[PDB]
Amino acid sequence: NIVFRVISTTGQIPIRDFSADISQVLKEKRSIKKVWTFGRNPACDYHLGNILPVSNKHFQILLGEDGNLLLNDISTNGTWLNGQKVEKNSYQLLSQGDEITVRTDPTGTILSLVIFINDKFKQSLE
């Protein structure tokens, strides 16, 4: 079952779905049940592309115990959530339809991703 889905507005990077086994999630002891990373390094879960001012590991999305998602900026050049730059190494709550934005040029072009959160997974407390 899918936790959330990530859509590109410009559309250079097709839709990506991110899932998690609900068995293995409840078996986890830690308050952070799963982590996805987004960055220039294709080792990441989501490749933001080989754009140099994008950090190799630029931000992470964390699945909380509550079933909610958190955004961790871990980047050199910053990460914007609904057009406001989040504090680096902080943990911000992701709401439905939120827009995560990173810088690509010094000219002020952007890469922009939108989170679509599957409510059926959250409610799936089986």
């Binding site: 001012p53 994008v54 950090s55 190799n56 050199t76 050049n77 010094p106």
Partner: peptide, 6 residues
């Protein structure tokens, strides 16, 4: 393989 600033 490092990352250029603003």
């Amino acid at each position: 393989l490092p990352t250029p600033p603003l």
